[PDB]
């Protein structure tokens, strides 16, 4: 068991932040700190005002270091909202006293872990997110794991994946602080939020295997997630986007759903939104789960449509049926507009695949994909036009299973 070396476990428990490691650290909460009453029972901090949130963790000075020798690991879930690539410097989790200990900060697109021996000697390691893949900010939940061996390496992991490895050379030992401070403090030289859950410290150096077991065990992998990593829900407006076409939003021409190039990457708030509706599932609690049967509603010009197949003006390709927006009764939705969802998460995104349902059952008929095709929609008459459309590949779609063009994301409209 890896829990044997766990010396701190900061968790929200019955609307109270506490250490559940058995080592009974003092947890003091000040200012504007919000606790989530539902999963993942996170706590929320801001950079706003003089009365911003502050969580002080004071560890028992003795008992926690009996098992520690040369190595320690820090793990936690974190989400930062409007993590812009030009973000000013912030210290977010501080554990430095008298120029000794460790600190976690954010600057630009970097999450930086600093290890301080004294005022003259320190080393840092970092994760820098891919700006091109996150033009609207890195605003999703991610899992951080930092391992340190004083006679070996500092290592940083994001979502179970090893990001960087730096040899500890300068430092020859650390006098750790009693205190860990969760607070958003601007470095002395627009407003940001931070969510944390399950902050753990281990008295050993966790390996790749341990980190992944940990990473997965803190998740409900059967629950589909939205773009930011929160639980995907029914009866909620989302912007539906294809992973391969992030600069595209949803529009309508005639029967067809068409994809247009978005204005900018300030946010995702452009074009029409979908609402996910449940038909079938094992649990009934508003959350979208793997193997659920569902359909999609959308409001366009004071009318509500459902997504469904339609016959295109001319053939698009073998086994290809276009998906459009139709004003149809439930019988037609079940026959031609029902989908089976299956989550597929990667390091880069929280996404899902959608399979065409056979009469609103869990039997599969095709996979929902995307492509550009030349045909006629709306009032097109004289000429065929190229349209980027959602398309279902029916019967034969084995080579599309591993294709990212079948990965769909949902950004909350809010």
């Amino acid at each position: 068991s890896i829990n044997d070396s766990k010396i701190l476990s900061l968790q929200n428990k019955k609307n109270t932040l506490m250490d559940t490691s058995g080592y009974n650290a003092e947890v003091r909460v000040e200012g504007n700190v919000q606790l989530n009453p539902i999963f993942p029972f996170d706590f929320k901090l801001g950079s706003s005002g003089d009365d911003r949130g502050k969580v002080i963790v004071t560890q028992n000075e003795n008992i926690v270091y009996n098992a520690m020798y040369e190595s320690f690991s820090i793990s936690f879930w974190i989400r930062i909202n409007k993590w812009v690539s030009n973000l000013p410097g912030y210290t977010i989790i501080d554990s430095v006293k008298n120029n000794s200990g460790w600190s976690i900060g954010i600057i630009s697109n970097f999450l930086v872990f600093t290890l301080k021996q004294n005022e003259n000697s320190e080393q840092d390691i970092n994760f820098s997110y891919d700006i091109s893949k996150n033009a609207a900010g890195y605003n999703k939940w991610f899992f951080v794991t930092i391992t340190t061996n004083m006679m070996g390496n500092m290592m940083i992991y994001i979502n179970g994946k090893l990001i960087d490895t730096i040899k500890v050379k300068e430092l020859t030992g650390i006098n750790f602080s009693k205190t860990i401070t969760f607070q958003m403090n601007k470095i002395p030289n627009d407003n940001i939020n931070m969510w944390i859950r399950d902050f753990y410290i281990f008295a050993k150096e966790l390996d790749d295997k341990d980190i992944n077991i940990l990473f997965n065990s803190l998740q409900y992998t059967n629950v589909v997630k939205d773009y930011w990593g929160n639980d995907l829900r029914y009866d909620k407006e989302y912007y539906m986007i294809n992973v391969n076409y992030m600069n595209r939003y949803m529009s309508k021409k005639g029967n067809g759903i068409v994809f247009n190039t978005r204005k900018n990457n300030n946010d995702f708030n452009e074009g029409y939104k979908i609402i996910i509706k449940r038909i079938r599932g094992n649990t009934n609690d508003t959350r979208v789960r793997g193997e659920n049967v569902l359909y999609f509603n959308t409001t366009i010009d004071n009318k509500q449509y459902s997504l469904g197949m339609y016959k295109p003006s001319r053939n698009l390709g073998t086994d290809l049926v276009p998906l459009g927006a139709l004003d149809q009764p439930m019988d037609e939705i079940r026959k031609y507009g029902s989908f089976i969802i299956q989550p597929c998460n990667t390091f880069d995104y929280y996404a899902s695949q959608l399979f065409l349902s056979s009469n609103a059952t869990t039997n599969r008929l095709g996979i929902l994909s995307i492509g550009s095709y030349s045909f006629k929609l709306g009032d097109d008459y004289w000429f065929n036009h190229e349209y980027l459309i959602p398309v279902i590949k029916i019967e034969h779609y084995a080579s599309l299973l591993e294709s990212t063009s079948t990965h769909w994301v949902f950004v909350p409209a809010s």
């Binding site: 197949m309 016959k311 049926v321």
Partner: peptide
Amino acid sequence: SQEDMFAKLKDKFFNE
């Protein structure tokens, strides 16, 4: 059957 559902989809959504 599945073969029936594919035949139905071909008849309804393909030209022709």
